[PDB]
Amino acid sequence: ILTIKLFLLINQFEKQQIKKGRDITSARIMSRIIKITIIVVLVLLYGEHFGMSLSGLLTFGGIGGLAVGMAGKDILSNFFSGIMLYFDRPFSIGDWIRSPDRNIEGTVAEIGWRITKITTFDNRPLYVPNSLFSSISVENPGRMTNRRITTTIGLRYEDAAKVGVIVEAVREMLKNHPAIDQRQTLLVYFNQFADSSLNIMVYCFTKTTVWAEWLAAQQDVYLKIIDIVQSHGADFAFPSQTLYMD
Amino acid sequence: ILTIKLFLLINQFEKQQIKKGRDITSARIMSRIIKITIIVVLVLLYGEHFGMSLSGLLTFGGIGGLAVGMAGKDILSNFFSGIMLYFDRPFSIGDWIRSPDRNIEGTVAEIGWRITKITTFDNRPLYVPNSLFSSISVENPGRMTNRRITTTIGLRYEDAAKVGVIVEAVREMLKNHPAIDQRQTLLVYFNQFADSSLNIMVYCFTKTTVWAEWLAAQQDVYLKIIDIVQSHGADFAFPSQTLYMD
């Protein structure tokens, strides 16, 4: 009677799957698989009243369960990480996330039990297995407080007498710029002997976090830097070489 | 009687395989393998009425099942991932899919219990084990909403006085182009001091998702950009060098 009840239940499931709309052969194969699995489980559970030697079933079930346990580790790990994400999540829907270990960059669209769906920046869907969120570092640029501007000014080696005044002028310009956050790091220093130029680092932050506003402020700063450099008699350096001719 | 029944059943299977058309020696070898496997399973299951010490079979079966369990992990994992794909699939037949972790690029042709068959873009079949779809990220360009156009305009360092007007002209041209989606990102800014040029980024989207239409729109935009740049007196920059002669 137990076998009849289980068979009728999975038969109802099978016609349910068919009515949902699916290939018939696949439904038959899945129904079989469930049939054999249920039969094996019942035989192992109900194998003493009409059963066998109590040593054979132990070994057989141990081998089968051991093989199944190592075979299904990844599928179960994904769902376990999904439960963990449900309880403790480092991001929310709509957050732009990133990782230095794997390519998962994009904005979160859906968080599921098995995979997370993320919209990339070329408008494509990306499906990430949940287990990855248990072994890699996740960065959240969507929760940033400032946008950083970093650049290098490469002057000619013959402009060594004007490095200090140029550095001071650039620092003053950055300090008086209305779009620059004055409570964050602000460094302008000459710090590198390059192959063909003397390099000056520029390192600052903007108040805004909007993409277009940050880009506009960066462009304005770059143009002002060009004007400052060219007004002091210096110039930017191309790659240079010394040629000896026969 | 059980052994006779099983032997006759697998013999019928063996002649079935032969009639299907296959090498005779391979069929004999497979029949043997099944013979020995069935004999071992029956001995371990039926080893108490005429059997042995109830400690030897436990150890023997444990060792055998442990070895078999670790030996067959990959084959069973592929089928488990096939079942998972049957129930929860991130793609469908005819979808162009991709992955940043492995080379599986192509359009899905068949989804099976063990492997997935994908048609590559040089018209070749590729067979991907199903377990890969449980540990890697899958991108679906076949479900994209827009096609992206990104490029860089490199102007000469002597064209620094015309960057703003060129940027404004390019932005206006992109804003008035009938093939550009105006509800998506649209950025045109000067954002890089390159080695030999000043770089302007162009970043926009098209309404269409068709390959040929997107390529045609991109070509039209590129030609218009060339005309705009050349009409303002600027020019594109080749790699440049400064040479000092003895």
UniProtKB/Swiss-Prot annotation, chains A, B:
Mechanosensitive channel that protects cells against hypoosmotic stress when highly overexpressed. Homoheptamer. The keyword Ion transport applies. Residues 11-37, 81-246 are cytoplasmic. GO terms for biological process: cellular response to osmotic stress. It comes from Escherichia coli (strain K12). This is Low conductance mechanosensitive channel YnaI. The keyword Ubl conjugation does not apply. Keywords: Cell inner membrane, Cell membrane, Ion channel, Ion transport, Membrane, Transmembrane, Transmembrane helix, Transport. It is a multi-pass membrane protein. The chain crosses the membrane at residues 38-58, 60-80. The chain holds residues 89 to 334 of 343 of the full protein. It is found in: Cell inner membrane. GO terms for cellular component: plasma membrane. The gene is ynaI. Residues 59 are periplasmic. Belongs to the MscS (TC 1.A.23) family. GO terms for molecular function: identical protein binding; mechanosensitive monoatomic ion channel activity.
